[PDB]
Amino acid sequence: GSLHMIDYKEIEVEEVVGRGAFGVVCKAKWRAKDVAIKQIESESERKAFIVELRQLSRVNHPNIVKLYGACLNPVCLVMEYAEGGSLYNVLHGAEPLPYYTAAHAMSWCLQCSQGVAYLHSMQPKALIHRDLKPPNLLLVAGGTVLKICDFGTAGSAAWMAPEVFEGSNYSEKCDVFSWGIILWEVITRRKPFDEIGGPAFRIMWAVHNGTRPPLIKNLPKPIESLMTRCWSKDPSQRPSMEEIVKIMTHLMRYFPGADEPLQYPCQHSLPDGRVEPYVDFAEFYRLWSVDHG
Ligand SMILES: CNC(=O)CN(Cc1ccccc1OC(F)F)C(=O)c1c[nH]c(C(=O)N2CCCC2)n1
Protein backbone atom coordinates (compact mmCIF):
# COMPACT_ATOMS: atom_id res chain seq x y z
CA GLY A 1 0.00 0.00 0.00
CA SER A 2 1.44 3.33 -1.24
CA LEU A 3 -0.58 6.48 -0.52
CA HIS A 4 0.30 9.89 -1.86
CA MET A 5 0.94 12.90 0.35
CA ILE A 6 -1.39 15.46 -1.23
CA ASP A 7 -1.25 19.23 -1.10
CA TYR A 8 -4.72 20.60 -0.19
CA LYS A 9 -3.99 23.85 -2.04
CA GLU A 10 -4.22 21.99 -5.39
CA ILE A 11 -7.71 20.67 -4.46
CA GLU A 12 -10.70 22.50 -5.84
CA VAL A 13 -13.59 21.72 -3.49
CA GLU A 14 -17.14 21.54 -4.81
CA GLU A 15 -20.50 20.70 -3.28
CA VAL A 16 -21.08 18.44 -0.29
CA VAL A 17 -22.36 15.01 -1.53
CA GLY A 18 -23.17 13.55 1.90
CA ARG A 19 -21.80 12.61 5.32
CA GLY A 20 -20.47 9.10 5.98
CA ALA A 21 -20.62 6.92 9.11
CA PHE A 22 -18.19 9.63 10.27
CA GLY A 23 -17.08 12.90 8.69
CA VAL A 24 -18.41 15.05 5.87
CA VAL A 25 -17.77 14.21 2.21
CA CYS A 26 -17.48 16.63 -0.69
CA LYS A 27 -17.02 16.31 -4.39
CA ALA A 28 -13.85 17.99 -5.68
CA LYS A 29 -11.21 18.33 -8.39
CA TRP A 30 -7.52 17.52 -8.12
CA ARG A 31 -5.07 17.29 -11.08
CA ALA A 32 -8.20 17.75 -13.23
CA LYS A 33 -9.65 14.40 -11.90
CA ASP A 34 -12.98 14.30 -10.05
CA VAL A 35 -12.51 13.10 -6.47
CA ALA A 36 -14.23 12.88 -3.13
CA ILE A 37 -12.60 14.42 -0.06
CA LYS A 38 -13.45 13.39 3.48
CA GLN A 39 -12.62 15.76 6.33
CA ILE A 40 -12.76 15.28 10.07
CA GLU A 41 -15.80 17.17 11.38
CA SER A 42 -14.91 18.04 14.97
CA GLU A 43 -11.70 16.04 15.78
CA SER A 44 -13.87 13.68 17.92
CA GLU A 45 -13.49 11.70 14.65
CA ARG A 46 -9.62 11.79 14.69
CA LYS A 47 -9.66 8.21 15.97
CA ALA A 48 -12.06 7.22 13.10
CA PHE A 49 -9.87 9.13 10.63
CA ILE A 50 -6.52 7.47 11.46
CA VAL A 51 -8.41 4.14 11.53
CA GLU A 52 -9.99 4.44 8.02
CA LEU A 53 -6.62 5.71 6.67
CA ARG A 54 -4.44 2.93 8.05
CA GLN A 55 -6.61 0.08 6.78
CA LEU A 56 -7.63 1.72 3.45
CA SER A 57 -3.86 2.09 2.67
CA ARG A 58 -3.54 -1.69 2.55
CA VAL A 59 -6.59 -2.40 0.35
CA ASN A 60 -6.86 -2.52 -3.38
CA HIS A 61 -9.99 -4.08 -4.84
CA PRO A 62 -12.55 -3.29 -7.60
CA ASN A 63 -15.48 -3.45 -5.16
CA ILE A 64 -13.94 -1.18 -2.53
CA VAL A 65 -13.56 2.59 -2.99
CA LYS A 66 -9.93 3.41 -3.98
CA LEU A 67 -8.11 5.89 -1.73
CA TYR A 68 -5.86 8.28 -3.83
CA GLY A 69 -4.07 9.80 -0.80
CA ALA A 70 -4.44 12.30 2.04
CA CYS A 71 -3.69 15.87 3.09
CA LEU A 72 -1.96 17.18 6.20
CA ASN A 73 -3.25 20.78 5.98
CA PRO A 74 -6.04 20.35 6.85
CA VAL A 75 -6.10 16.63 7.62
CA CYS A 76 -8.41 14.98 5.01
CA LEU A 77 -8.81 11.75 2.94
CA VAL A 78 -8.96 11.79 -0.86
CA MET A 79 -10.99 9.05 -2.57
CA GLU A 80 -12.12 8.26 -6.10
CA TYR A 81 -15.51 9.77 -6.97
CA ALA A 82 -17.97 8.57 -9.55
CA GLU A 83 -21.57 9.30 -10.52
CA GLY A 84 -24.10 7.23 -8.60
CA GLY A 85 -25.42 6.98 -5.04
CA SER A 86 -25.83 4.83 -1.99
CA LEU A 87 -27.49 1.45 -2.28
CA TYR A 88 -29.73 2.82 0.47
CA ASN A 89 -31.04 5.65 -1.70
CA VAL A 90 -31.51 3.35 -4.71
CA LEU A 91 -33.62 0.97 -2.63
CA HIS A 92 -35.58 3.29 -0.37
CA GLY A 93 -34.64 6.90 -1.03
CA ALA A 94 -35.85 9.87 -3.03
CA GLU A 95 -38.60 9.21 -5.53
CA PRO A 96 -38.96 8.40 -8.31
CA LEU A 97 -37.25 5.05 -7.45
CA PRO A 98 -35.48 3.02 -10.19
CA TYR A 99 -36.77 -0.39 -11.21
CA TYR A 100 -34.37 -3.29 -10.68
CA THR A 101 -34.34 -7.03 -11.22
CA ALA A 102 -33.47 -10.18 -9.33
CA ALA A 103 -30.24 -10.13 -11.34
CA HIS A 104 -29.35 -6.67 -10.06
CA ALA A 105 -30.13 -7.85 -6.56
CA MET A 106 -28.04 -11.01 -6.69
CA SER A 107 -25.14 -9.13 -8.53
CA TRP A 108 -25.09 -6.47 -5.77
CA CYS A 109 -24.74 -9.06 -3.09
CA LEU A 110 -22.18 -11.08 -5.05
CA GLN A 111 -20.06 -7.94 -5.53
CA CYS A 112 -20.32 -7.03 -1.82
CA SER A 113 -19.33 -10.61 -0.91
CA GLN A 114 -16.31 -10.35 -3.27
CA GLY A 115 -15.14 -7.10 -1.60
CA VAL A 116 -15.60 -8.44 1.88
CA ALA A 117 -13.95 -11.83 1.04
CA TYR A 118 -10.95 -9.78 -0.03
CA LEU A 119 -10.89 -8.02 3.40
CA HIS A 120 -11.25 -11.24 5.34
CA SER A 121 -8.28 -12.72 3.47
CA MET A 122 -5.91 -9.87 4.41
CA GLN A 123 -2.56 -10.87 5.87
CA PRO A 124 -1.42 -11.01 8.57
CA LYS A 125 -4.80 -10.18 10.15
CA ALA A 126 -8.27 -10.15 8.58
CA LEU A 127 -9.95 -6.74 8.12
CA ILE A 128 -13.50 -6.92 9.52
CA HIS A 129 -15.67 -4.19 8.01
CA ARG A 130 -18.21 -4.41 10.84
CA ASP A 131 -20.54 -1.66 9.49
CA LEU A 132 -21.95 -3.33 6.32
CA LYS A 133 -25.26 -1.85 5.39
CA PRO A 134 -26.86 -0.31 2.36
CA PRO A 135 -25.93 3.31 3.38
CA ASN A 136 -22.22 2.33 3.14
CA LEU A 137 -22.42 0.58 -0.21
CA LEU A 138 -22.08 2.80 -3.19
CA LEU A 139 -23.63 2.01 -6.57
CA VAL A 140 -21.87 3.35 -9.62
CA ALA A 141 -21.75 2.77 -13.38
CA GLY A 142 -25.54 3.07 -13.88
CA GLY A 143 -26.32 1.22 -10.66
CA THR A 144 -24.45 -1.94 -11.82
CA VAL A 145 -21.17 -1.83 -9.89
CA LEU A 146 -21.19 -1.82 -6.09
CA LYS A 147 -18.27 -0.43 -4.03
CA ILE A 148 -17.84 -0.81 -0.32
CA CYS A 149 -17.17 2.37 1.72
CA ASP A 150 -16.95 3.66 5.31
CA PHE A 151 -14.23 1.77 7.15
CA GLY A 152 -14.14 4.43 9.92
CA THR A 153 -15.72 1.94 12.34
CA ALA A 154 -12.68 -0.38 11.66
CA GLY A 155 -28.08 3.56 13.02
CA SER A 156 -26.63 0.09 12.35
CA ALA A 157 -28.72 -2.08 14.74
CA ALA A 158 -30.71 -3.64 11.90
CA TRP A 159 -27.63 -5.08 10.15
CA MET A 160 -25.61 -5.91 13.24
CA ALA A 161 -24.84 -9.46 14.47
CA PRO A 162 -26.13 -10.23 18.02
CA GLU A 163 -22.70 -11.10 19.42
CA VAL A 164 -21.29 -7.63 18.45
CA PHE A 165 -23.84 -5.66 20.55
CA GLU A 166 -23.80 -8.40 23.20
CA GLY A 167 -20.32 -7.01 23.91
CA SER A 168 -18.90 -10.45 23.14
CA ASN A 169 -15.85 -11.61 21.25
CA TYR A 170 -16.65 -11.62 17.57
CA SER A 171 -14.92 -12.39 14.36
CA GLU A 172 -15.15 -11.75 10.64
CA LYS A 173 -18.46 -13.68 10.83
CA CYS A 174 -20.16 -10.49 11.98
CA ASP A 175 -19.96 -9.28 8.38
CA VAL A 176 -21.52 -12.52 7.10
CA PHE A 177 -24.52 -11.78 9.31
CA SER A 178 -24.86 -8.26 7.86
CA TRP A 179 -24.40 -9.59 4.30
CA GLY A 180 -27.41 -11.85 4.76
CA ILE A 181 -29.63 -9.08 6.12
CA ILE A 182 -28.72 -7.10 3.08
CA LEU A 183 -29.47 -10.03 0.69
CA TRP A 184 -32.95 -10.06 2.23
CA GLU A 185 -33.23 -6.30 1.85
CA VAL A 186 -32.38 -6.19 -1.90
CA ILE A 187 -34.78 -9.11 -2.61
CA THR A 188 -37.66 -7.52 -0.72
CA ARG A 189 -36.98 -3.81 -1.21
CA ARG A 190 -37.93 -3.40 2.47
CA LYS A 191 -36.06 -1.97 5.41
CA PRO A 192 -35.04 -4.67 7.84
CA PHE A 193 -37.03 -4.46 11.12
CA ASP A 194 -38.86 -1.26 10.07
CA GLU A 195 -42.12 -2.40 11.71
CA ILE A 196 -40.28 -2.61 15.08
CA GLY A 197 -38.55 0.77 14.84
CA GLY A 198 -38.58 2.48 18.23
CA PRO A 199 -35.00 3.39 19.11
CA ALA A 200 -32.00 1.06 18.45
CA PHE A 201 -32.41 -0.96 21.64
CA ARG A 202 -35.79 -2.32 20.56
CA ILE A 203 -34.18 -3.91 17.48
CA MET A 204 -31.21 -5.19 19.52
CA TRP A 205 -33.56 -6.75 21.96
CA ALA A 206 -35.45 -8.39 19.11
CA VAL A 207 -32.44 -9.83 17.27
CA HIS A 208 -30.77 -11.01 20.52
CA ASN A 209 -33.96 -12.94 21.14
CA GLY A 210 -33.67 -14.67 17.71
CA THR A 211 -35.95 -12.44 15.59
CA ARG A 212 -34.91 -12.29 11.98
CA PRO A 213 -36.39 -10.74 8.89
CA PRO A 214 -39.42 -12.63 7.64
CA LEU A 215 -39.15 -15.39 5.07
CA ILE A 216 -39.68 -14.47 1.45
CA LYS A 217 -42.51 -16.03 -0.54
CA ASN A 218 -41.45 -18.12 -3.58
CA LEU A 219 -37.73 -17.62 -2.74
CA PRO A 220 -35.52 -20.33 -4.30
CA LYS A 221 -34.47 -22.80 -1.54
CA PRO A 222 -30.79 -22.44 -2.36
CA ILE A 223 -31.14 -18.69 -1.69
CA GLU A 224 -33.26 -19.35 1.34
CA SER A 225 -30.55 -21.62 2.84
CA LEU A 226 -27.69 -19.24 2.11
CA MET A 227 -29.61 -16.36 3.67
CA THR A 228 -30.82 -18.03 6.82
CA ARG A 229 -27.39 -19.65 7.51
CA CYS A 230 -25.88 -16.20 7.27
CA TRP A 231 -28.33 -15.21 10.07
CA SER A 232 -27.51 -18.00 12.56
CA LYS A 233 -27.00 -16.97 16.19
CA ASP A 234 -23.89 -19.10 16.45
CA PRO A 235 -21.25 -17.36 14.30
CA SER A 236 -19.44 -20.70 13.65
CA GLN A 237 -22.61 -21.94 11.80
CA ARG A 238 -22.39 -19.01 9.30
CA PRO A 239 -20.56 -19.58 6.09
CA SER A 240 -17.28 -17.98 5.24
CA MET A 241 -17.40 -15.10 2.80
CA GLU A 242 -15.36 -17.25 0.34
CA GLU A 243 -18.12 -19.91 0.43
CA ILE A 244 -20.66 -17.15 -0.25
CA VAL A 245 -18.79 -15.74 -3.11
CA LYS A 246 -18.49 -19.18 -4.73
CA ILE A 247 -22.19 -19.91 -4.18
CA MET A 248 -23.30 -16.48 -5.46
CA THR A 249 -20.97 -16.82 -8.43
CA HIS A 250 -22.51 -20.14 -9.38
CA LEU A 251 -25.96 -18.72 -8.90
CA MET A 252 -25.45 -15.90 -11.38
CA ARG A 253 -25.82 -18.25 -14.37
CA TYR A 254 -29.55 -18.21 -13.49
CA PHE A 255 -29.60 -14.39 -13.23
CA PRO A 256 -28.57 -12.83 -16.52
CA GLY A 257 -28.94 -9.06 -16.90
CA ALA A 258 -26.88 -7.66 -13.95
CA ASP A 259 -25.17 -5.39 -16.49
CA GLU A 260 -28.34 -3.49 -17.50
CA PRO A 261 -28.21 0.14 -16.15
CA LEU A 262 -31.02 1.34 -13.88
CA GLN A 263 -33.02 3.37 -16.43
CA TYR A 264 -36.61 2.41 -15.90
CA PRO A 265 -38.92 4.18 -13.50
CA CYS A 266 -40.89 2.42 -10.84
CA GLN A 267 -43.75 3.26 -8.50
CA HIS A 268 -44.11 0.46 -6.02
CA SER A 269 -46.80 -0.24 -3.51
CA LEU A 270 -45.60 -1.57 -0.22
CA PRO A 271 -47.88 -4.12 1.39
CA ASP A 272 -46.54 -9.76 7.85
CA GLY A 273 -44.97 -13.27 8.18
CA ARG A 274 -44.00 -14.32 4.65
CA VAL A 275 -43.33 -11.17 2.54
CA GLU A 276 -43.53 -11.01 -1.24
CA PRO A 277 -40.31 -10.33 -3.02
CA TYR A 278 -39.89 -7.09 -4.96
CA VAL A 279 -37.76 -8.89 -7.57
CA ASP A 280 -39.23 -11.74 -9.65
CA PHE A 281 -37.88 -15.30 -9.55
CA ALA A 282 -39.93 -16.84 -12.48
CA GLU A 283 -37.06 -16.52 -14.91
CA PHE A 284 -34.65 -18.16 -12.44
CA TYR A 285 -37.01 -21.16 -12.07
CA ARG A 286 -37.26 -21.39 -15.85
CA LEU A 287 -33.52 -21.31 -16.37
CA TRP A 288 -32.97 -23.72 -13.50
CA SER A 289 -35.37 -26.36 -14.88
CA VAL A 290 -33.68 -25.97 -18.28
CA ASP A 291 -30.27 -27.03 -16.91
CA HIS A 292 -31.85 -29.65 -14.62
CA GLY A 293 -34.06 -31.61 -17.11
C1 LIG B 1 -27.35 10.47 -4.25
N2 LIG B 1 -26.16 10.12 -3.45
C3 LIG B 1 -26.19 10.19 -2.06
O4 LIG B 1 -27.24 10.35 -1.47
C5 LIG B 1 -24.87 10.15 -1.32
N6 LIG B 1 -23.77 9.69 -2.20
C7 LIG B 1 -23.15 8.49 -1.65
C8 LIG B 1 -22.32 8.65 -0.40
C9 LIG B 1 -22.04 9.86 0.19
C10 LIG B 1 -21.26 9.91 1.33
C11 LIG B 1 -20.77 8.73 1.88
C12 LIG B 1 -21.05 7.52 1.28
C13 LIG B 1 -21.84 7.48 0.14
O14 LIG B 1 -22.17 6.34 -0.52
C15 LIG B 1 -22.00 5.04 -0.01
F16 LIG B 1 -20.73 4.93 0.44
F17 LIG B 1 -22.88 4.88 1.00
C18 LIG B 1 -23.37 10.23 -3.40
O19 LIG B 1 -24.06 11.10 -3.88
C20 LIG B 1 -22.16 9.79 -4.13
C21 LIG B 1 -22.02 9.76 -5.50
N22 LIG B 1 -20.78 9.31 -5.76
C23 LIG B 1 -20.19 9.08 -4.58
C24 LIG B 1 -18.81 8.61 -4.45
O25 LIG B 1 -18.19 8.35 -5.46
N26 LIG B 1 -18.21 8.49 -3.22
C27 LIG B 1 -16.85 7.97 -3.02
C28 LIG B 1 -16.82 7.56 -1.56
C29 LIG B 1 -17.67 8.63 -0.91
C30 LIG B 1 -18.79 8.84 -1.92
N31 LIG B 1 -21.02 9.37 -3.56
| Catalytic site positions | 131
CA 42, 43, 48, 54 torsion-angle sign: positive
264-292 b/e (C-beta count within 10 Å ≥ 16 → b): eeeeeeeeeeebebbbebebbeeebeeee
Give resolution, Å, one decimal: 2.0
Residues 74 and 105 in one domain: no
**One domain for residues 78 and 199:** no
Show binding-site residues for ATP.
17-25, 38
Question: By the 8 A CB rule, do 231 and 180 touch?
Answer: yes
Among candidates 203, 255, 251, which has minimal Cα distance to 223?
251
Q: Please give the Cα distance from 29 to 14 (Å, whole number).
A: 8
Q: How far is the CA of 194 from the centre of ligand 1 (A)?
A: 23
Tell me the C-alpha distance between 205 and 30, whole Å.
47
Contact 267, 98 (CB under 8 A): no
| Same-domain pairing of 28 and 128 | no
> Are 157 and 64 found together in one domain?
no
**Judgement on whether residues 135 and 201 belong to the same structural domain of the protein:** yes
Range of the domain at 17: 1-83
Same domain? 117 vs 13 = no
Distance CA 83, CA 140 (A): 6
Name the structure determination technique: X-ray
101 lines ligand 1 (CB under 6 A): no
Binding residue ranges: 17-25, 38
Cis ω before 135 (30° cut-off from 0): no
Q: Gap positions in the chain, given as the residue before each gap (C–N > 2.5 A)?
A: 154, 271
Same domain, 163 and 44: no
3-state secondary structure the chain: CCCEEECHHHEEEEEEEECCCCCEEEEEEECCEEEEEEECCCCCCHHHHHHHHHHHHHCCCCCECCEEEEECCCCEEEEECCCEEEHHHHHHCCCCEECCCHHHHHHHHHHHHHHHHHHHCCCCCCCCCCCCCHHHEEEECCCCEEEECCCCCCCCHHHCCHHHHCCCCCCCHHHHHHHHHHHHHHHHCCCCCCCCCCCHHHHHHHHHCCCCCCEECCCCHHHHHHHHHHCCCCHHHCCCHHHHHHHHHHHHCCCCCCCCCCCCEECCCCCCCEECCCCCCHHHHHHHHHHCC
* Domain co-membership, 97 together with 195: yes
Same domain, 29 and 144: no
Residue 63 CB less than 6 A away from ligand 1: no
Check whether residue 61 and residue 198 sit in a common domain: no
Number of domains the chain contains = 2
107 lines ligand 1 (CB under 6 A): no
CA atoms within 13 A on the CB side of 272: 7
The domain boundary residue, chosen from 65, 83, 101: 83
Residue after which a domain boundary falls, among 52, 83, 114: 83
What is the distance in A from the centroid of ligand 1 to the CA of 224? 31
Q: Is 97 in the pocket of ligand 1 (CB under 6 A)?
A: no
